[PDB]
């Protein structure tokens, strides 16, 4: 009947480039790996099983396709698709000076036929109040208006939005809250003069 051909390990060159053999992630093929590798708990007086017909070497997620020789070759080709970070934004303090708004977003990757994660719609917008144009009266009203979202020690304002289904709608809604909270802190309405001496922050 049909016979078994000798494995290609014998015909493998000594100095051949490994990444050409495994371009993508593939399971451990005993014939395609020149390395004699043994794993499995040995018998009372014996040696661990060979690399042919062994399931223990098949369960493991191999890293033969990410060899350090291949990593340098892979990454260097990707260097075209990049742009440098501006040198003037070296210190983190300067980043706040030139960009006072930071926005946190999350993306989730999981194994399955679906990518829809309801936890990926959250948007966290944090603004340092010292970089805005609030007056003495306007800043005091904004703190009294936003409530617990403002930290008195770090002077940071955190706005978290979850109602919009998409991250782009939440991002547009989050920035909408920031601008309407600022245009409202400057409207000294008539009833504001009815301040009580127990409501004063100082």
């Amino acid at each position: 009947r049909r016979k078994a051909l000798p494995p290609r390990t014998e015909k493998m060159a000594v100095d051949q480039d490994w990444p050409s053999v495994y371009p993508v992630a593939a399971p451990f093929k005993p014939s395609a790996v020149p390395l004699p590798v043994r794993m499995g708990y040995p018998v009372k007086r014996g040696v661990p099983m060979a690399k042919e017909g062994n399931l223990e070497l098949l369960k493991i997620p191999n890293f033969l396709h990410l060899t350090p020789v291949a990593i340098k070759r892979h990454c260097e080709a990707l260097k075209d698709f990049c742009t440098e970070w501006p040198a003037a934004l070296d210190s983190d303090e300067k980043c706040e000076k030139h960009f006072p708004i930071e926005i946190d977003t999350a993306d989730y990757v999981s194994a399955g036929p679906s990518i829809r994660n309801p936890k990926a719609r959250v948007v966290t917008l944090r603004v340092k109040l010292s970089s805005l144009n609030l007056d003495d009266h306007a800043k005091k009203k904004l703190i009294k208006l936003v409530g617990d979202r403002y930290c008195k020690s770090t002077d940071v304002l955190t706005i978290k939005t979850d109602r919009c289904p998409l991250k782009r709608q939440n991002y547009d809604y989050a920035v909408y809250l920031l601008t309407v909270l600022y245009h409202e802190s400057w409207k000294t309405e008539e009833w504001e003069k009815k301040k009580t001496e127990a409501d004063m922050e100082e």
Binding site: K144, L145, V146, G147, R163, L177, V180, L181, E184, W191, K194, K195, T196, A198, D199
Partner: protein, 99 residues
């Protein structure tokens, strides 16, 4: 609690979208009913059961087409044949005890 605090509590609620006018503890449930997804419409509830009808029917047709060989169904058929040979089978309709 002063009149100044009432305006600020309402003004903040107006911008962020909560309820402005005072609402009872029991009356807030109607907001909760529409805010959250009802229990009967969650994917965990109506899609709880895998469709065994498609799973059983598909493997039934593949068994007759020679692409899937089921040992368990073969066991039933082989034993069912022996019962017929021994003379103990399933009677037709209207043959149980009326005769």
């Amino acid at each position: 609690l002063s009149e100044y605090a009432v305006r600020m509590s309402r003004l903040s609620a107006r911008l962020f979208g909560e309820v402005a006018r005072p609402t009872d503890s029991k009356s807030m449930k109607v907001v909760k009913l529409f805010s959250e997804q009802p229990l009967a419409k969650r994917k965990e509830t109506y899609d709880w059961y895998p469709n065994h009808n498609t799973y059983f029917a598909l493997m039934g047709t593949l068994r007759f087409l020679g692409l899937y060989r089921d040992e368990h169904q073969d066991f039933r058929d082989e034993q069912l044949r022996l019962k017929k040979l021994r003379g103990k089978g399933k009677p037709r309709k209207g043959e149980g005890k009326r005769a």
